[PDB]
C-alpha cells in the first residue's frame, strides 16, 4: 500500500552524480528503491540515464545495496 519510492524528478544524465533536485519521492507501482534512501543515494551514479518521472531502481545505481 503506501510505500512510496524515489522518482526522477528530472532527466538524470549517464554517469552523473545524483544531487537531492533529481529526486521527489512517489507512491508508484512497481515498488522500486524506498523514498528513504534518497540521502544515500546523493553522489552515487546511475548506469543509464533516467527519464522523468521514472521510479529508481536498485540496478539502475552502481554501488548501490538496501
Given at each position: 500500500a503506501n510505500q512510496a519510492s524515489?522518482?526522477?524528478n528530472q532527466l538524470i544524465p549517464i554517469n552523473t552524480?545524483?544531487?537531492l533536485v533529481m529526486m521527489?519521492?512517489?507512491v508508484v507501482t512497481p515498488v522500486g528503491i524506498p523514498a528513504e534512501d534518497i540521502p544515500r543515494?546523493?553522489?552515487m551514479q546511475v548506469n543509464r540515464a533516467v527519464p522523468l518521472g521514472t521510479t529508481l531502481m536498485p540496478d539502475m545505481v552502481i554501488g548501490y545495496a538496501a
Open positions: 524515489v522518482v526522477a552524480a545524483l544531487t521527489r519521492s512517489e543515494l546523493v553522489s
